[PDB]
mmCIF file of C-alpha atoms in Angstrom:
data_model
loop_
_atom_site.group_PDB
_atom_site.id
_atom_site.type_symbol
_atom_site.label_atom_id
_atom_site.label_comp_id
_atom_site.label_asym_id
_atom_site.label_seq_id
_atom_site.Cartn_x
_atom_site.Cartn_y
_atom_site.Cartn_z
ATOM 1 C CA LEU A 1 -14.732 91.838 6.976
ATOM 2 C CA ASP A 2 -17.120 91.192 9.860
ATOM 3 C CA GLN A 3 -20.348 89.920 8.213
ATOM 4 C CA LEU A 4 -20.564 86.243 7.418
ATOM 5 C CA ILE A 5 -23.163 85.149 4.880
ATOM 6 C CA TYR A 6 -23.754 81.529 3.988
ATOM 7 C CA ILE A 7 -24.801 80.695 0.447
ATOM 8 C CA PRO A 8 -26.264 77.162 0.108
ATOM 9 C CA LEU A 9 -27.057 74.955 -2.841
ATOM 10 C CA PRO A 10 -29.986 76.404 -4.820
ATOM 11 C CA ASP A 11 -33.565 75.429 -4.136
ATOM 12 C CA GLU A 12 -36.180 74.410 -6.694
ATOM 13 C CA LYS A 13 -37.396 77.834 -7.801
ATOM 14 C CA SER A 14 -33.777 78.919 -7.936
ATOM 15 C CA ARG A 15 -33.009 75.941 -10.214
ATOM 16 C CA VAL A 16 -35.889 77.025 -12.460
ATOM 17 C CA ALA A 17 -34.482 80.525 -12.686
ATOM 18 C CA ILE A 18 -30.935 79.239 -13.358
ATOM 19 C CA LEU A 19 -32.173 77.033 -16.186
ATOM 20 C CA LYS A 20 -34.080 79.993 -17.603
ATOM 21 C CA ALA A 21 -31.146 82.355 -17.323
ATOM 22 C CA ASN A 22 -28.717 79.962 -19.024
ATOM 23 C CA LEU A 23 -30.889 79.407 -22.067
ATOM 24 C CA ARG A 24 -31.864 82.957 -23.138
ATOM 25 C CA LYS A 25 -29.317 82.896 -25.976
ATOM 26 C CA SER A 26 -30.339 79.508 -27.324
ATOM 27 C CA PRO A 27 -33.421 78.752 -29.414
ATOM 28 C CA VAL A 28 -35.365 76.351 -27.160
ATOM 29 C CA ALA A 29 -38.463 74.615 -28.405
ATOM 30 C CA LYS A 30 -41.603 75.368 -26.447
ATOM 31 C CA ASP A 31 -42.258 71.638 -25.908
ATOM 32 C CA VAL A 32 -39.574 71.513 -23.188
ATOM 33 C CA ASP A 33 -40.636 71.422 -19.526
ATOM 34 C CA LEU A 34 -38.126 73.130 -17.268
ATOM 35 C CA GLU A 35 -40.253 72.815 -14.130
ATOM 36 C CA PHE A 36 -40.132 69.051 -14.434
ATOM 37 C CA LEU A 37 -36.407 69.396 -15.078
ATOM 38 C CA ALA A 38 -35.844 71.194 -11.748
ATOM 39 C CA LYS A 39 -37.622 68.504 -9.808
ATOM 40 C CA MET A 40 -35.240 65.659 -10.718
ATOM 41 C CA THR A 41 -32.065 67.650 -9.957
ATOM 42 C CA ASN A 42 -32.129 67.599 -6.215
ATOM 43 C CA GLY A 43 -28.677 68.678 -5.024
ATOM 44 C CA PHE A 44 -27.100 70.108 -8.122
ATOM 45 C CA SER A 45 -25.194 73.380 -8.180
ATOM 46 C CA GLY A 46 -25.337 76.099 -10.824
ATOM 47 C CA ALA A 47 -22.301 74.826 -12.723
ATOM 48 C CA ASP A 48 -23.933 71.389 -13.186
ATOM 49 C CA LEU A 49 -26.983 73.003 -14.755
ATOM 50 C CA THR A 50 -24.827 75.146 -17.090
ATOM 51 C CA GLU A 51 -22.906 71.955 -17.947
ATOM 52 C CA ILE A 52 -26.020 69.990 -18.922
ATOM 53 C CA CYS A 53 -27.402 72.929 -20.947
ATOM 54 C CA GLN A 54 -24.182 73.288 -22.919
ATOM 55 C CA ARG A 55 -24.021 69.536 -23.472
ATOM 56 C CA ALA A 56 -27.545 69.520 -24.979
ATOM 57 C CA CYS A 57 -26.414 72.406 -27.138
ATOM 58 C CA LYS A 58 -23.416 70.383 -28.363
ATOM 59 C CA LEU B 1 -17.778 30.266 -1.194
ATOM 60 C CA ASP B 2 -16.372 31.015 -4.653
ATOM 61 C CA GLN B 3 -19.139 33.067 -6.387
ATOM 62 C CA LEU B 4 -19.167 36.800 -5.747
ATOM 63 C CA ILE B 5 -22.400 38.668 -6.519
ATOM 64 C CA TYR B 6 -22.709 42.437 -6.164
ATOM 65 C CA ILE B 7 -26.087 43.891 -5.083
ATOM 66 C CA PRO B 8 -26.350 47.635 -5.730
ATOM 67 C CA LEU B 9 -28.790 50.275 -4.639
ATOM 68 C CA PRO B 10 -32.229 49.665 -6.203
ATOM 69 C CA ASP B 11 -33.266 51.221 -9.516
ATOM 70 C CA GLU B 12 -36.494 53.053 -10.260
ATOM 71 C CA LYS B 13 -38.741 50.060 -11.026
ATOM 72 C CA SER B 14 -37.216 48.313 -8.041
ATOM 73 C CA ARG B 15 -38.178 51.335 -5.905
ATOM 74 C CA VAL B 16 -41.737 51.140 -7.244
ATOM 75 C CA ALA B 17 -41.915 47.443 -6.324
ATOM 76 C CA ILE B 18 -40.466 48.082 -2.848
ATOM 77 C CA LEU B 19 -43.019 50.799 -2.161
ATOM 78 C CA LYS B 20 -45.759 48.499 -3.356
ATOM 79 C CA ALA B 21 -44.523 45.561 -1.217
ATOM 80 C CA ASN B 22 -44.269 47.608 1.983
ATOM 81 C CA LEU B 23 -47.812 48.951 1.759
ATOM 82 C CA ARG B 24 -49.887 45.808 1.187
ATOM 83 C CA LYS B 25 -50.983 45.728 4.801
ATOM 84 C CA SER B 26 -51.965 49.342 5.029
ATOM 85 C CA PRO B 27 -55.117 50.966 3.590
ATOM 86 C CA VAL B 28 -53.693 53.368 1.025
ATOM 87 C CA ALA B 29 -55.986 55.825 -0.773
ATOM 88 C CA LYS B 30 -56.042 55.504 -4.515
ATOM 89 C CA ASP B 31 -55.123 59.172 -4.954
ATOM 90 C CA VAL B 32 -51.489 58.443 -4.117
ATOM 91 C CA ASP B 33 -48.951 58.326 -6.949
ATOM 92 C CA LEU B 34 -46.115 55.904 -6.170
ATOM 93 C CA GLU B 35 -44.480 56.236 -9.594
ATOM 94 C CA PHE B 36 -43.904 59.924 -8.953
ATOM 95 C CA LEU B 37 -42.663 58.942 -5.492
ATOM 96 C CA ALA B 38 -39.948 56.684 -6.907
ATOM 97 C CA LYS B 39 -38.629 59.429 -9.208
ATOM 98 C CA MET B 40 -37.648 61.820 -6.438
ATOM 99 C CA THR B 41 -35.843 59.203 -4.342
ATOM 100 C CA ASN B 42 -32.687 58.829 -6.357
ATOM 101 C CA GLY B 43 -30.172 56.971 -4.204
ATOM 102 C CA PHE B 44 -32.279 55.585 -1.385
ATOM 103 C CA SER B 45 -32.059 52.084 -0.095
ATOM 104 C CA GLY B 46 -34.882 49.747 0.887
ATOM 105 C CA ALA B 47 -34.671 50.651 4.568
ATOM 106 C CA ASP B 48 -35.244 54.340 3.816
ATOM 107 C CA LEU B 49 -38.416 53.559 1.897
ATOM 108 C CA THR B 50 -39.702 51.361 4.716
ATOM 109 C CA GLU B 51 -38.809 54.171 7.137
ATOM 110 C CA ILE B 52 -40.802 56.765 5.232
ATOM 111 C CA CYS B 53 -43.793 54.445 4.831
ATOM 112 C CA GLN B 54 -43.902 53.703 8.539
ATOM 113 C CA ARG B 55 -43.559 57.400 9.318
ATOM 114 C CA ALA B 56 -46.553 58.268 7.191
ATOM 115 C CA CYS B 57 -48.424 55.476 8.983
ATOM 116 C CA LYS B 58 -47.505 57.046 12.342
#
């Protein structure tokens, strides 16, 4: 194992795509703005976004 | 000295008022949205906001 690849925290477009990919199974109303939702969450990881999606589902 | 008062980091309306109070001397164009500017800066102090205002002035 000689290649080293660093994987940082996700950027804004990445957060948009994570929030889209987590919610394909759920019926989401079209009134919801995900692009505003990715702007507030500066410094989250993927697991935090999955956590908040599942909490809204609960 | 028997009273103890805790002073936390400023909230969102407080950040709006800090950004307003720092920029009274400067000619600011009316196209600038400060209320959007206070939403991004979750967890700044007052000195950080004065720093970024003076850097824009520079």
